[PDB]
Amino acid sequence: STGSATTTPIDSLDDAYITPVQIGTPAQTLNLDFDTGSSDLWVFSSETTASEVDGQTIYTPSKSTTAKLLSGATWSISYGDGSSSSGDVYTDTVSVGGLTVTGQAVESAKKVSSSFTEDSTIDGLLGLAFSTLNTVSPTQQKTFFDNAKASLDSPVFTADLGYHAPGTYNFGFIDTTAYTGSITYTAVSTKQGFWEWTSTGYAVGSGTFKSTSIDGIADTGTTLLYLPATVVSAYWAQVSGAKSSSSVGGYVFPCSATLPSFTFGVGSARIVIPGDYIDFGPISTGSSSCFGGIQSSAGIGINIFGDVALKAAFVVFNGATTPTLGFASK
Numbered sequence: 001s002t003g004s005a006t007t008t009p010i011d012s013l014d015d016a017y018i019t020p021v022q023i024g025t026p027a028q029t030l031n032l033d034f035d036t037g038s039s040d041l042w043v044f045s046s047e048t049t050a051s052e053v054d055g056q057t058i059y060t061p062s063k064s065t066t067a068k069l070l071s072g073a074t075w076s077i078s079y080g081d082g083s084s085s086s087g088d089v090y091t092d093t094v095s096v097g098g099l100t101v102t103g104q105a106v107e108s109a110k111k112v113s114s115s116f117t118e119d120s121t122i123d124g125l126l127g128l129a130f131s132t133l134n135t136v137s138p139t140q141q142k143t144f145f146d147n148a149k150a151s152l153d154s155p156v157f158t159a160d161l162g163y164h165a166p167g168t169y170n171f172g173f174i175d176t177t178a179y180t181g182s183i184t185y186t187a188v189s190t191k192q193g194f195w196e197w198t199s200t201g202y203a204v205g206s207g208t209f210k211s212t213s214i215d216g217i218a219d220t221g222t223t224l225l226y227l228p229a230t231v232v233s234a235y236w237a238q239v240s241g242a243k244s245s246s247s248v249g250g251y252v253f254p255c256s257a258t259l260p261s262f263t264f265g266v267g268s269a270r271i272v273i274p275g276d277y278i279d280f281g282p283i284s285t286g287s288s289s290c291f292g293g294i295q296s297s298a299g300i301g302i303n304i305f306g307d308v309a310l311k312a313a314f315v316v317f318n319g320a321t322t323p324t325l326g327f328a329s330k
């Protein structure tokens, strides 16, 4: 089997991408944030505290003839940015882009944090990291991809995120028309539960490539590119007037600037992020200070190749017995 679904930016900045997901019988379609940095499929629901729902579409398990309470199971997740949610668990039929999994754990939120409530476009998350990170207790549950894998034509999914435009998540096949050149594959460590890999270096604009190992994660659920402070300083030094602002929370730059590209290495291959992908717009409406799309990871503990980086590539998440990542230009 295969599946193919379009993923759409939630706003004009590409802050996140939403993909329609069919849950239950008859289908209830919710727009979920596909997140290769986490491993829970959770949704706003009829059980979510009413004051914490503001415009999201909810899953109502009592209206699904295939929903079953997973008795005794609870979940609770804290993300890298401090956002959180928790609740109980149903199993139900879940379909993405024509690919159907029966008995998928659908984690129903009883509580969500302010960033989730404020995101009226996001009805939940669909985790695509390794199932070892799934938070369901006392019986850990598998991700949608893990449940689908054995049925797929090939045990892979691909992320093709658009710049200020829709893109595609495919399951079970690699669309050879969706990228240019060749796909370069690179080793993955699953030791932390992430799609963790080592970039071979970087360049700023037309500058020389610096060969240096940068361990990080491929994370579709993170908006920006978070890299070591040395790398980030080297980038922003090429933008007149750019500076790190403690009050804003990262590097800002004059909105009048033209940003240089940023290149990262995948083995001997190179992925070029155009400068415009690094502009996240005014820090507040009407401001001439703009927020940068490349930020320091120093306070995180891990480097994160988020959407800024991934949207410059066609990315293969190869879930074979020994997983690997592939990157192609497009």
Ligand SMILES: O[C@H]1C[C@H]2CC[C@@H](C1)N2Cc1ccccc1
Pocket (backbone or CB within 6 Å): 015, 016, 114, 115, 116, 118, 119, 223
């Ligand atoms: O306060 C709420 C949560 C965040 C921050 C501002 C706005 C509403 N949301 C933008 C956003 C959505 C998805 C990913 C990244 C950023």
